Amino acid sequence: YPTVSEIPVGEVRLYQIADGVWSHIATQSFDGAVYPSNGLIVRDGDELLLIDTAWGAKNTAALLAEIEKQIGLPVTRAVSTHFHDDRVGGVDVLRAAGVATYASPSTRRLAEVEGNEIPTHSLEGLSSSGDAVRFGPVELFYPGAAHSTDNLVVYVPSASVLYGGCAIYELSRTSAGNVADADLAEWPTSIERIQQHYPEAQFVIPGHGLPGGLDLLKHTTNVVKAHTNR
Ligand SMILES: C=CC[C@H]1c2cccc(C(=O)O)c2C(=O)N1c1cccc(OC)c1
Ligand SMILES: [Zn+2]
Ligand SMILES: [Zn+2]
């Protein structure tokens, strides 16, 4: 799996998780350091559903070019899973490319307040923790507040792929990361809802770093709780 040192900023890599399911991986500078960042691509017949931008206008253009090169099906819809720039930065590129962009009303509001790019369409039915709605070939799930108050997770039932987004940490992380927008007290409860709702997930994809299995869920709870204790 690609690492930050192996991906120059501005390039995007794709990685088959399972049939018709890819992650996309990019790198971006934030406050003077470079970080890797993941999203998801899910085949939707002869179209593609995109989960999250590649963290910036130029990265997201590179994302679309790499999808066209490697997959060759059009991206028709995109869902952003919270309001931070690594999720919505590039939405303007997507919209101009003909992609219909979606996010919860919470994400759209927070993005606007923050001065970030704003998905066009509002995803209703996800404002209460435990809410689940169908969106093409995936289920969208609001687990409750965690990394941010608006963070969504995405399940691909055909492939048993659980995309946790930035509410889920990779196994190599032992300290909490950026908690500025987080709800540390609710984060374990939110993970518990994910665990109970998707107990058959075979692959778990964090928002940043290496994918793994279901242990990424308990691992994230461990890290968040240890931060709170300490
Ligand atoms: C700050 C690091 C960049 C990225 C990242 C990489 C690796 C781990 C994490 C983490 O969850 O701590 C993050 C994270 O939060 N990011 C982020 C991206 C855009 C806006 C933002 O504002 C709060 C934060
Ligand atoms: Zn974030
Ligand atoms: Zn993130």
**What is the CATH topology assignment?**
Metallo-beta-lactamase, Chain A
Q: Number of helical runs? A: 6
Structure classification = alpha/beta
The CATH superfamily is Ribonuclease Z/Hydroxyacylglutathione hydrolase-like
Computed CA radius of gyration, to the nearest angstrom: 16 Å
- Distance between the ends: 32 Å
> What is the H/E order?
EEEEHEHHEHEEEEEHEH
CATH architecture: 4-Layer Sandwich
Oligomer: monomer
**Tally of structural domains:** 1
Percent helix:
25-40%
Bound molecules: ligand 6TU, zinc ion
Report on the biggest sheet.
Answer: 7 strands, mixed
- In percent, how much strand structure appears in the residues? 25-35%
Q: For the largest beta sheet, what order do the strands appear in spatially? A: 1-2-3-4-5-6-7
How many β-strand runs? 12
The level 1 CATH classification is Alpha Beta
Shape descriptor: globular
Cofactor: Zn(2+)
Binding site for Mg(2+) 2: 11
Binding site for Zn(2+) 1: 46
Binding site for Zn(2+) 2: 82, 84, 86, 147
